[PDB]
Short mmCIF file of C-alpha atoms in Angstrom, two decimals:
data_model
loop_
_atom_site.label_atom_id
_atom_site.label_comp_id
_atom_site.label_asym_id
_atom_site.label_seq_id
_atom_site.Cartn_x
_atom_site.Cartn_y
_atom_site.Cartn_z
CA UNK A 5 -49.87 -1.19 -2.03
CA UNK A 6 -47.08 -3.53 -0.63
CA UNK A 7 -43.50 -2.76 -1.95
CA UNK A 8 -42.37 -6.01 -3.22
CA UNK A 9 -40.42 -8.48 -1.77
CA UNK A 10 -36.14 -8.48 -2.33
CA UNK A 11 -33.24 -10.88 -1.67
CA UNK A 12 -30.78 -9.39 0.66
CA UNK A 13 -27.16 -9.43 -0.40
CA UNK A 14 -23.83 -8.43 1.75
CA UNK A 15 -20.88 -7.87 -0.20
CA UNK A 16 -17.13 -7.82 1.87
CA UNK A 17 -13.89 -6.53 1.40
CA UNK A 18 -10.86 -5.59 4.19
CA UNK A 19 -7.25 -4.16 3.34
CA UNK A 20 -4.81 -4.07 6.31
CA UNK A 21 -3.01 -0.68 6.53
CA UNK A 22 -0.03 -0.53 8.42
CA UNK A 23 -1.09 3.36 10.14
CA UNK A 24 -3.07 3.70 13.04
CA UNK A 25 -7.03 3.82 12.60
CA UNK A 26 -6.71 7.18 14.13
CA UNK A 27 -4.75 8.10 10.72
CA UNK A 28 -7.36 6.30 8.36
CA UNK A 29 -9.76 7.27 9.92
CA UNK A 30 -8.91 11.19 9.93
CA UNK A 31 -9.27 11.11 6.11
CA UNK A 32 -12.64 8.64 6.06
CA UNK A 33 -14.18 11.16 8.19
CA UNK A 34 -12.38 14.27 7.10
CA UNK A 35 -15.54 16.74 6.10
CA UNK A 36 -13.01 18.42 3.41
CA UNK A 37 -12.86 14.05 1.31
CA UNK A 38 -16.43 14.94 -0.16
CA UNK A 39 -15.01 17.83 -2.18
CA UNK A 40 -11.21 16.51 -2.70
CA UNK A 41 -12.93 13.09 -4.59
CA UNK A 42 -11.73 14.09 -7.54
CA UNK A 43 -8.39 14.24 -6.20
CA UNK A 44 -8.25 10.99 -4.41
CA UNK A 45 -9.60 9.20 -7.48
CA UNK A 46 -8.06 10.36 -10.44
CA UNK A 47 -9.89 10.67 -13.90
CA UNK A 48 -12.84 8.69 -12.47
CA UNK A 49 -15.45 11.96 -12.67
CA UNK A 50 -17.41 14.16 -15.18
CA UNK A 51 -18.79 15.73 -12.65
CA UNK A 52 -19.53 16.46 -9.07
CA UNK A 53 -21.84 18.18 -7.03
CA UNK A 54 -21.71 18.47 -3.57
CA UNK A 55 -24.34 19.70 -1.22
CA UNK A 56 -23.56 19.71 2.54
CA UNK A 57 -20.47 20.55 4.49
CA UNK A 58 -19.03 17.47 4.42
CA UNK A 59 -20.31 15.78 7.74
CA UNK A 60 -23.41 13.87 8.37
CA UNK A 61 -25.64 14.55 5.91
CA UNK A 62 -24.02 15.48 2.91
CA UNK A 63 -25.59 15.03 -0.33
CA UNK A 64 -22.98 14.03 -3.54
CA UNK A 65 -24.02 13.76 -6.80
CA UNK A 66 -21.74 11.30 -8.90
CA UNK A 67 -21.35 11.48 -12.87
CA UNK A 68 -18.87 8.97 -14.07
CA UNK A 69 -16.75 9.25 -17.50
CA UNK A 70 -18.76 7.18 -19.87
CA UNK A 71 -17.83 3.28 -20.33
CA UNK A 72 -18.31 3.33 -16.33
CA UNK A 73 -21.85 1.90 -15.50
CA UNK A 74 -22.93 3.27 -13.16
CA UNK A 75 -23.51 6.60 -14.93
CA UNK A 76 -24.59 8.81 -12.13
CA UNK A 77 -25.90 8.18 -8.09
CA UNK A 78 -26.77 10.43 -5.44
CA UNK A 79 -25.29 9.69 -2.42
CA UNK A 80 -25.52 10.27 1.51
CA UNK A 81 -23.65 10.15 4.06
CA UNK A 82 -25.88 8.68 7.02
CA UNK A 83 -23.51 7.88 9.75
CA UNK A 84 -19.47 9.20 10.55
CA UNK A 85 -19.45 7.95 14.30
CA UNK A 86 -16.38 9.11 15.69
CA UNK A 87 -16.34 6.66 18.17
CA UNK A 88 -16.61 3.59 17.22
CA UNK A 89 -14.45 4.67 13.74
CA UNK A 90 -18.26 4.24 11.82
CA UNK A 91 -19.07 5.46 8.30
CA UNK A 92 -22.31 4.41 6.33
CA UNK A 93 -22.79 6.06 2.89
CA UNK A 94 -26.34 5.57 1.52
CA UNK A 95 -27.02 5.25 -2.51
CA UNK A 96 -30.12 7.54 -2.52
CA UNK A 97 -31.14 7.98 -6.38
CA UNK A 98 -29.86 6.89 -9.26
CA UNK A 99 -27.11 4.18 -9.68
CA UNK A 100 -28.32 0.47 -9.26
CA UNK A 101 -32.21 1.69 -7.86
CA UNK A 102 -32.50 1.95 -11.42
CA UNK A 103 -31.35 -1.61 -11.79
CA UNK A 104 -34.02 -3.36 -9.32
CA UNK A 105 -32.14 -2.61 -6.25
CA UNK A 106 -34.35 -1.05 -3.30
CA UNK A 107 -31.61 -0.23 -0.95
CA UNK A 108 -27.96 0.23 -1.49
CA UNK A 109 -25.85 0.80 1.44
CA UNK A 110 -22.16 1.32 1.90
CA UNK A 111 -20.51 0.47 5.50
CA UNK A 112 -16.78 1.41 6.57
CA UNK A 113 -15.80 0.67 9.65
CA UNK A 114 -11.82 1.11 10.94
CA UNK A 115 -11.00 -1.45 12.94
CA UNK A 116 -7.41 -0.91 14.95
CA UNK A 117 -5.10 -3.95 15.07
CA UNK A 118 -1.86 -2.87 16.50
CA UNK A 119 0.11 0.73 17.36
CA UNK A 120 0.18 0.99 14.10
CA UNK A 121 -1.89 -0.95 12.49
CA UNK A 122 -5.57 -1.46 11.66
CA UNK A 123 -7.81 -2.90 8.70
CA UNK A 124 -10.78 -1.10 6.89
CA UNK A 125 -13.78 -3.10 7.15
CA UNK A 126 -15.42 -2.10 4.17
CA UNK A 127 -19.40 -3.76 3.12
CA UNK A 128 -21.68 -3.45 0.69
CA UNK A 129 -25.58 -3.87 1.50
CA UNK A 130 -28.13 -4.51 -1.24
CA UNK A 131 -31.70 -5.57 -1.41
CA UNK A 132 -32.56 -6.72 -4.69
CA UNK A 133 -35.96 -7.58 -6.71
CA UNK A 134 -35.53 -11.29 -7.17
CA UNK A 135 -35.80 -11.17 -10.99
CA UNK A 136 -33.02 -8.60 -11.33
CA UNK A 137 -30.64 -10.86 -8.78
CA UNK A 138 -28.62 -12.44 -11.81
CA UNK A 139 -28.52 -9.05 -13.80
CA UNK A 140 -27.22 -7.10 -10.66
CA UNK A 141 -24.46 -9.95 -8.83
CA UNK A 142 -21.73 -9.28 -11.29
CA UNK A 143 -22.31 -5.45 -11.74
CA UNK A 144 -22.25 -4.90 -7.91
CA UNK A 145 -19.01 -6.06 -6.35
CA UNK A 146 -16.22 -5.12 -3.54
CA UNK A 147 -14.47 -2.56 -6.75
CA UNK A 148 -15.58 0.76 -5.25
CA UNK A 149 -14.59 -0.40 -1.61
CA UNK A 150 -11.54 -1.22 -2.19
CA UNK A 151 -10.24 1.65 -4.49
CA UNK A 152 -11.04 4.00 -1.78
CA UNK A 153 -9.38 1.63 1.08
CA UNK A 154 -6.45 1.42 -1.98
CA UNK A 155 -6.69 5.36 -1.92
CA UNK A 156 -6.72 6.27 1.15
CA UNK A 157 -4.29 4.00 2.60
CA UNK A 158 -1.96 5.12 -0.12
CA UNK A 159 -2.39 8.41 0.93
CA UNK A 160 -1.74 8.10 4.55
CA UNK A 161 1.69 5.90 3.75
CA UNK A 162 3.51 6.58 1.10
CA UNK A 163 5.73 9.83 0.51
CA UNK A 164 6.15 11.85 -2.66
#
């Protein structure tokens, strides 16, 4: 058996943050986030389950209140490269593979622009059965990205 053939699609979305990457990304890559979602994104969960210390390969399993779609996912987190400021969180079960998508992939990278200043790269990979392309474009879109670039910068900024 072949696997059948999918569309590639590569979703974009950037918010300039006037903090240092350094700052943004000390709370992209901050092993405590995984646990403190619920915090950062208020009234978004039923439920969460973490498995993993919060690094490189940490499991999460999502539930969303209902009138979200999607439901639930399992995620991973495949990549938190230090270096180059590097996050890739993988949708591993659940979510929009149930929905014709093969691979889901979410890419974060924090790109410094001044002393100051930088701007989260944020992308969204998908590879999609081409009968399910029209079903899946307007369900899958930059929405998730940029709440947690909304968050986060938020977060780092402002002062209760």
């Amino acid at each position: 058996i072949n696997q059948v053939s999918t569309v590639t699609k590569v979703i974009h979305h950037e918010l300039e943050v006037a903090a240092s990457a350094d700052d943004i990304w000390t709370v992209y890559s901050w092993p405590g986030l995984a646990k403190h979602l619920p915090d950062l994104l208020p009234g978004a969960f039923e439920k969460l389950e973490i498995i993993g210390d919060g690094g490189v390969g940490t499991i999460l399993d999502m539930t969303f209140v209902p009138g979200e779609f999607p439901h639930e996912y399992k995620e991973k987190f495949i990549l938190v490269d230090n270096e180059h400021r590097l996050k890739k969180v993988q949708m591993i079960e659940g979510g929009y593979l149930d929905l014709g998508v093969t691979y889901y992939m979410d890419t974060i990278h924090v790109v410094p622009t001044g002393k100051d200043s930088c701007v989260i790269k944020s992308s969204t990979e998908y590879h999609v059965k081409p009968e399910f392309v029209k079903i899946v474009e307007p369900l899958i879109t930059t929405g998730p990205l940029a709440a947690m670039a909304d968050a986060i910068s938020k977060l780092v900024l402002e002062h209760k």
